[PDB]
């Protein structure tokens, strides 16, 4: 009995995709509904769309764009072709919206059903799908991210806390640099970190949910995971007590570091994935590490929440599509019996 269930859902090569095209620069998974691969045959570019409900029937079509990201739910796709961005309805075969930027967009992502986040060299913008609005600048980038490869952009549930992540390879290390912006205080904070996520968490006795910020880093102090409340507790709330635990990197994982995080709000657990393909499971309330193992021989370069199970799904460099979820019937028993932590297990039970 293990606290989690692992599973290979797909091998992309068996869906007809060339290994050259299975990578961060050409393959996106903005939700667990779709995977999008930008392929190039001769001098014709194509997008292959894989509906995760009907994997065996790919929508492979010729297109002129350097970058493609599927809406989290709708059959709507955004395409970047130079400095020109377009939002396209696939089933209507029609253009909804277009915009031409001044600066190149080096990174972009859907943060909701309606909004595309646009990252330039200098700034972050949010572009609304509905209406006529042009991209709106939210904040200017901080010097500490200059020259970084941008790997992620995250928001809390209310869109009041915004987080940009960049990394940089140096001789003896990968530097992690984050910028956390408060939409209400109108101020940013530079932070050293490699992977992060927000979560809603209900403390017992409180009037409202707390908004939590969780981030992992492999820095000067070794592997660390921090869980802190962001913002002012509402009337009726006590504050969440800051946690600070370890991320263990074995000796044989010398160059390893964190790359992805998703958080289960059904179970209040943190899923953490590293560059080498290890997963770690932590309790959100206490910061206790429940579990750790190696799930992939190759880098998992993109993840999303597995929404039906409150788990994590990802894609690796070999084209394996993998997921990890909580085993709902075994996690309490495993904490009680294998971990020998009846206090944590009661607390999880009790909070259920």
């Amino acid at each position: 009995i293990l606290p989690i269930r692992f599973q290979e859902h797909l091998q992309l090569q068996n869906l007809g995709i060339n290994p050259a095209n299975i990578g961060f620069s050409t393959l996106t998974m903005e939700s667990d509904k779709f995977i999008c691969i930008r392929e190039k045959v001769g001098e014709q570019a194509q997008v292959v769309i894989i509906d995760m409900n009907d994997p065996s029937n790919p929508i492979r079509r010729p297109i002129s764009a350097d970058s493609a990201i599927m809406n989290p739910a709708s059959k709507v796709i955004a395409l970047k072709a130079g400095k020109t961005l377009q939002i396209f309805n696939i089933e209507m075969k029609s253009k909804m919206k277009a915009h031409t930027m001044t600066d190149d967009v080096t990174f972009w992502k859907w943060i909701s059903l309606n909004t595309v986040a646009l990252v330039t060299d200098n700034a972050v913008y949010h572009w609304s799908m509905e209406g006529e609005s042009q991209p709106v600048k939210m904040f200017d980038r901080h010097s500490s991210l200059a020259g970084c490869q941008i790997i992620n952009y995250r928001t809390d549930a209310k869109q009041k806390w915004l987080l940009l992540t960049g990394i940089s390879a140096q001789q003896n290390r990968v530097v992690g640099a984050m910028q956390l912006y408060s939409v209400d205080r109108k101020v940013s904070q530079p932070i050293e970190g490699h992977a992060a996520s927000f979560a809603q968490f209900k403390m017992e006795g409180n009037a409202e949910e707390s908004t939590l910020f969780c981030f992992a880093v492999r820095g000067q102090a070794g592997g660390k995971l921090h869980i802190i409340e962001v913002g002012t507790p509402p009337t009726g709330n006590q504050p969440f007590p800051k946690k600070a635990v370890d991320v263990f990197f074995p000796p044989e994982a010398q160059n390893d570091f964190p790359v992805a995080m998703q958080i289960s709000e059904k179970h209040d657990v943190v899923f953490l994935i590293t560059k080498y393909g290890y997963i770690h499971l932590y309790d959100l309330e206490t910061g206790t590490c429940i579990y750790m193992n190696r799930i992939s021989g190759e880098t998992i370069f993109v993840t999303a929440p597995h929404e039906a199970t409150a788990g994590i799904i990802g894609v690796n460099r070999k084209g394996q599509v993998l997921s990890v979820c909580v085993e709902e019937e075994n996690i309490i028993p495993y904490i009680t019996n294998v971990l020998q932590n009846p206090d944590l297990a009661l607390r999880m039970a009790v909070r259920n």
Binding site: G23, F24, S25, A169, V174, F301
Partner: peptide, 7 residues
């Protein structure tokens, strides 16, 4: 130049 997933 080298994308991060290949580091």
């Amino acid at each position: 130049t080298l994308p991060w997933d290949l580091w």
